[model samples]
Target: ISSETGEMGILWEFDPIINKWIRLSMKLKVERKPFAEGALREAYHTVSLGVGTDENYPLLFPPIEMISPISKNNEAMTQLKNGTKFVLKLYKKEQASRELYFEDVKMQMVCRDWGNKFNQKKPPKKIEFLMSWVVELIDRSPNGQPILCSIEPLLVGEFKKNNSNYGAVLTNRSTPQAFSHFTYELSNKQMIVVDIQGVDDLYTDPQIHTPDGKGFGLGNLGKAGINKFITTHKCNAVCALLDLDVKL
Candidate 1:
């Protein structure tokens, strides 16, 4: 059975000869593979999304640590080798009047597997969590930065076609980095509808270019190459598009 959250597992099986239902144990294995030995390689892009409190609207929160029950208990970690496990959770801190509380907003899980990407001898139990803050502005500072009245946590994988308890941006596998089909509210008592269809990153190599014209390779670069890399991807290119509608 597959849940709406993209988690899939086998539940049971039918045996016609015995006229019985056989329950099957489910296990999920998420393997973290290393890059090809000498190729330009890294893990899938880490997504850190945020809203601007200052001039930089999308502030990236540094990657946070994942707390696992196995860390403190050696026996449990070892025993988990044969058991099913759930991982990753998102939380929101809410305050009503003067009281504060936390709510569990979203969660995800991955199956354990063999050898580590960093150390082949290690168990494949490392986990990390990502969160994007959805803030409610109570007021504004003198400098115009937002004063948060409440903050909500949503899952990075939460998308509209799946659930309403959370929000999502639409994107296709062909254009993985491109996002669209999301909306937001502004301070003027108006809601803005956003539809983003595509994005082009300058760091991306062009499908066709002169043979001598080297595009910015992921990591290998010289002084001029470094200059072009920074100027294109970081400074000049139109990285994304947002088609917005405001309710007057």
Candidate 2:
């Protein structure tokens, strides 16, 4: 249905004996918003000190090691290691409320083991740490590391109207027989459901299908090739979202 809105994105099945393409649309909600106190304190002061890339300082090493379904006794990491001042939710999801609302959503930690590159098919290594929802409080940082904040595009896409925060990289396209879990919930009721395993590929910028134009080399993870690696490594300005979304 839906010649414009007849209602029925999909729900097909037929088989007295045999047929397929059966059952879908598993509902999704994920809403929690309110992060605009001057764009969340300038993305938490541009990640506690104007970014230096590692996709915004992925804990460039120093005690830092809290990965395992994100649980260092969570409560947003114990009120961000006790300096208090919390409140960094900002995740939205209303598939189509007034056309769009998929805001900044967060989740990271990709240091290998995305099902071992889908059983060694390779691709997705070297991404040490990036747990985000705008961090950096543990007494401000003397090596109390925890950054990666600035990435805001607000809303737009209802049917490819572009930049709906590109759904925040669609949770790294989870797949390879996905099944994640995690919901300790002591303070604000934590959650992390995953379940992805097929159908959800919505792409766009692989150099827009080049066929001999010499592109898609994907150097600094592309998006103008991360501003040519941020103008030869000065760092800060690594945006990428060609309508991203492929969590399957």
Candidate 3:
């Protein structure tokens, strides 16, 4: 899907690790339109997105703990990966709240953080769970309005439905729903992240339910929301590692 066109936008992504912002050259398809739609957002695919196309760069991965951690020596390390694959998401309505934009960004960070923790307790050779970067469009919207869009690594393979707010697949492909149980249990039974969907183990667009069903957005169902997944989510070794009390 490296179909690139002349349409481009300069974007900025927040790097929580370095506590700073990075720049990226976003190349678009010839038509410059969204490929899919959801309840709240529309999805846009990037054509060969990376840094240093016009002598500028950004959108880099976290530095290597590879070869050697002490390889931290300065060598102008950033944007080392070119044409990195990712998907961009923006609200469908023109007047999407500014706080609303960041809300998804905020919770997704929790997912990414929690998913990182969850990975260690899983079986071997697991692909890391990734959340999108909350990015700003240096260019204004078609309505000439400022906006915040999310960018996540493009997931490959067939799209899988692991669970929704109130339901989940209880058969052989139980790992995704199992992760929701893991996140909820890890959060002290206060926050149950449902509506989990993605390609294989690489998940995106999850709904988080809190004790009162407040904070994360409209998808939240609060205490009432907690009962649904618990009834449907059957756990196994995923719960075994954490010793979650929920029935498997």
Candidate 4:
């Protein structure tokens, strides 16, 4: 849908099985892909625009075409034409593995009976597009068609602490200090819970690793990396926390 002035488009996911729609207002800072020595990849997608590469960008072409159990290309485009906000319900397959990398991706919609290269191996036990929004993909180069907003399009990794306040203490490691600790709990049914806390300063200098070497935490988890998980962290830390546990 065309965006309104105050319209910070809300994302949506549509469930075909039950015929329902879901809303997703999660906003991530948009991060970049990472490279060697923990450097941020130059071509990443987020805040700015343009997908990193001609890779499997999630929302590259709006109404992201589906080539799997069902075809969402037409349906997605239909919704966009209507200009209504929507949500998508995405489900992860079990032991059935699928690479999210640009090289290997499998997206299928039962409705269309279309599947990608990866989908041929194992049919998804279940799937959902439960997140939705009206996102516009900006063109980076001079001549390129505008596309829809994307998620986690940028690649990323950890980096050193050089900017923030807690960084200074992190660089020097004479005293033993807690750097960073976050936990993720995975359940048998594919339920995953992540709890992260402790260690405010998440950076380290080159020569501060006890007697072993120089170490602390790595650098900062790139904006893209952290933004990918937290989705809407900067908006309201409290709300984000609540959203995760609301169902429980």
Candidate 5:
């Protein structure tokens, strides 16, 4: 199912026969936060969501990590294997709150299968959209824990969207980076409403790796040539659309 806040709206669906019902929602919310004294900016975050199906596939592994950005300077360096598991979590922030807007936010787990490198993920998970935004993946290898890699809006809009017009100067240059719908247009009401999901960095708190394998949690696996995969045939899908509502 789905729900809407002041301006943004979110919806999700799940099947009962194949998997459990996933009740997820996303919001296009905007709010100002204090990075420092006298320094505040408008940021968007996820709203709410529920868990969907649980996907677990056998490992085939891929030809990654060989070229992955491994911090050699890491004091506690430990050799890592190829077929390690990793997860990327998307979070949302509230209007004025800095804490995690929601706790039960779901995350996506991506792994590499070297035997079959099709570039498509196996276990696709969806994190309920909230008000805060951050993307982090954990390296699970007995020791390699979660790490927050570089999150960029294509390294171009990673910092911020190019739309600066608050009232009438609507910006439509860059394409939207939505988890669900691709584009959304405001209704033709006197006042237009919008939900602004935050960039995938603010909420990400990177975790350092350790020497012992038992200390660290699951290690993240995806980061190279990242692309969104959408299909109706697959179990998990990411679809985008626009919803318009007007009052008479």
Candidate 6:
């Protein structure tokens, strides 16, 4: 248990794919209190920024797609997509390293890229779409230590959760489950993508598990994780087409 406090400073965004930091002149302020909390993290509903980056910053960070902020939060919508209102997230467990937060982001990038790549191999009508959360970061504590937190686009809609690293609930939602299977096969059984949740197909805080029970921080349960998923997951048509195996 640590008593370190989070802080605000020159906003720095980490590109998940490139694995680098893009410094921004904008000073960011996250609400001291969170509007929401969950099993792993807390979410602050309001985060204010002083100055944003040039709109054409592909080299810095590619803007991820967002569903339009709902009518209830039009003021934020007016502030622009990457604007003054967003949720800030920080891990509750406070592991040895804040790098685990980026590990989550890194897995999202992996899933997003592979999701699209796998879909590209499908027929146009058969193609499936998967959404990945775009998370920005704050990696400093009040005393110059790692207190990593995430800045995320405010998403308001039918919030839904599907499964965890092992269990399954909404068996009818075929694509997300199927994609997890594909990620498993696509990686040569090295990992299984799980803990899918969000509004519809859009996902956040995904957990990836590898064979030896390594990587992806606390959520990864290892080769045991893969077997648990196989046990719980009922193969869908997508998995059948891809020839992914399921536990009988």
Please, what is the whole-model Cα lDDT of each candidate in the order they appear? Answer: 0.20, 0.21, 0.60, 0.24, 0.20, 0.58
Question: Among these predicted structures, which one has the highest TM-score?
Answer: 3
- Where model 5 places Cα greater than 4 Å from the true spot, the runs are 1-160, 168-248
Candidate 3 C-alpha lDDT tens digits along 1-248: 12443345544343445443344445543226887788778888764433332224332122222112222321112322345556778788744655555566657766767777777776442434565555556555544545667766677887666677766553366566667787787788878777667777777887788887678867778877788777766777656656667652
Clashing pairs in 3: 213-222
Once fitted onto the true fold, the runs of candidate 2 whose alpha carbons sit more than 4 angstroms away are 1-77, 80-83, 91-223, 230-248
lDDT of 1 by residue, 100-186 (tens): 111111110000010011122221222121221112222323134332211111223322221111122233221111111111111
lDDT of 6 by residue, 1-248 (tens): 01223333333344444544444323355677877888777888754544444222322122232111112322122332333566667767635354565556556666666656667768222322232222334334333553556555567787666778876656467777777878887788888778777766666667788899876778889978888887787787877877776642
Question: What TM-score would you give candidate 6 relative to the actual structure?
Answer: 0.69
For candidate 1, the TM-score is: 0.15
lDDT of 3 at 121: 74
lDDT of 5 at 83: 20
For candidate 1, which ten residues in a row score worst on lDDT? 106-115
| TM-score of every model versus the real structure | 0.15, 0.19, 0.71, 0.20, 0.19, 0.69
The total number of steric clashes, by the backbone 3 Å criterion, in model 5 comes to: 41
- After TM-score superposition, the amount by which residue 92's alpha carbon in candidate 1 deviates from its true location, in angstroms, is 13
Could you give candidate 4's per-residue lDDT for residues 1-248 as a string of tens digits? 22322222233334445433333332222333412222321222333211112122343312244222233332334333332332211222111111221111111121112112112323222111112232333332213433333222211244334222122322332111111101111111111111111122121211111112121123223333323333422222322332323221
Q: Across residues 108-161, which tens digit of lDDT does each residue of candidate 2 receive?
A: 212112223223432232111112232222222323222222222122233121
Q: After superposition, how far is residue 27 of candidate 4 from its true place, in Å?
A: 1.3
Each candidate structure's count of clashing pairs: 2, 1, 1, 45, 41, 0
The residue-level lDDT of candidate 4 at 111 comes to: 13
| Runs with alpha carbons beyond 4 Å of true place in candidate 6 | 1-7, 10-21, 48-84, 93-96, 122-146, 241-248
